[PDB]
From Swiss-Prot:
Known outcome of mutating C20S: Loss of dimerization and of ion transport activity
Lineage of producing organism: Eukaryota, Metazoa, Chordata, Craniata, Vertebrata
SUPFAM superfamilies: GST C-terminal domain-like (SSF47616), Thioredoxin-like (SSF52833)
pH sensitivity of activity: Optimally active at neutral to slightly alkaline pH.
One GO BP annotation of this record: chloride transport
Protein name: Chloride intracellular channel protein 1
Assembly and oligomerization: Monomer. Homodimer (in vitro). Interacts with TRAPPC2. Dimerization requires a conformation change that leads to the exposure of a large hydrophobic surface. In vivo, this may lead to membrane insertion. Interacts with AKAP9.
Record comment: activity regulation: The oxidoreductase activity is inhibited by rapamycin, amphotericin B and IAA-94. The channel conductance is regulated by pH and redox membrane potential. Inhibited by IAA-94.
Gene that encodes it: CLIC1
Naturally occurring in which organism (per UniProt): Homo sapiens (Human)
Keyword terms of this UniProt record: Acetylation, Cell membrane, Chloride, Chloride channel, Cytoplasm, Disulfide bond, Endoplasmic reticulum, Glutathionylation, Ion channel, Ion transport, Membrane, Nucleus, Oxidoreductase, Phosphoprotein, Transmembrane, Transmembrane helix, Transport, Voltage-gated channel
Keyword Transmembrane: yes
Length: 233
């Protein structure tokens, strides 16, 4: 009911949505809440008077909820999940605490792999990324408490916590998107088909407009990584 406006980082043209997994995460949350909201891209190099008055500190993303400004993605998400409550808006929080931690090291192992310029560490950092993807794949093929005794021993649910998207998917999918896009372009690296749980996860995720329509363009994600990703000769 109070106006909800999400301020995200602008891409290469200073206008369109830029590479930012925290901006896409909140976008996915506001989408799954069913609330009315706008998104305003911010070019950090050419900040409008409006933005400098609203958020003098410069933090992005930030949220205007009515007249109050919220900073820090995790705090913004906690705020949105508490205030947009049933029956008008769905609870998005996962039931199973492990849904919130599965694959949460993937992004850090990716960052080390893609920022690495030492040819001698490429293999090691690849195995590190593969291992973390594997831990996720185990979680995704582990049956959840709701699947209790119902391909014996294998989960076939769609997302981290069940067949509905949760806050947990909102945090992980934007990061997994970047990993896929950036490793294809710059390392000829691809999530092995053997990780059947992870490929089923992503196929369900790309099918849902909440993920697919909140993704920045491949071209933006690749430009954001070109400097660090090419340092590896």
């Amino acid at each position: 009911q109070p106006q909800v406006e999400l301020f995200v980082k602008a891409g290469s043209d200073g206008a369109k949505i830029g590479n930012c997994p925290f901006s896409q995460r909140l976008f996915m949350v506001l989408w799954l809440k069913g609330v009315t909201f706008n998104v305003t891209t911010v070019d950090t190099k050419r900040r409008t008077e409006t933005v400098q008055k609203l958020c003098p500190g410069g933090q992005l993303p930030f949220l205007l909820y009515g007249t109050e400004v919220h900073t820090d993605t995790n705090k913004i998400e906690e705020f949105l999940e508490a205030v947009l409550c049933p029956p008008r808006y769905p609870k998005l929080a996962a039931l199973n605490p492990e849904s919130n931690t599965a694959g949460l090291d993937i992004f850090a192992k990716f960052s080390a792999y893609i920022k690495n310029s030492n040819p001698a560490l490429n293999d090691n950092l690849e195995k590190g990324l593969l291992k973390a993807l594997k831990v996720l794949d185990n979680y995704l093929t582990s049956p959840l408490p709701e699947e209790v005794d119902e391909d014996e021993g294998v989960s076939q649910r769609k997302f981290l916590d069940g067949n509905e998207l949760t806050l947990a998917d909102c945090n992980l999918l934007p990061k997994l998107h970047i990993v896929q896009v950036v490793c294809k372009k710059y390392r000829g690296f691809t999530i092995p088909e053997a990780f059947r749980g992870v490929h089923r996860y992503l196929s369900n995720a790309y099918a849902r407009e909440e993920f697919a329509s909140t993704c920045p363009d491949d071209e933006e994600i690749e430009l954001a990584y070109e400097q660090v990703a090419k340092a590896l000769k």
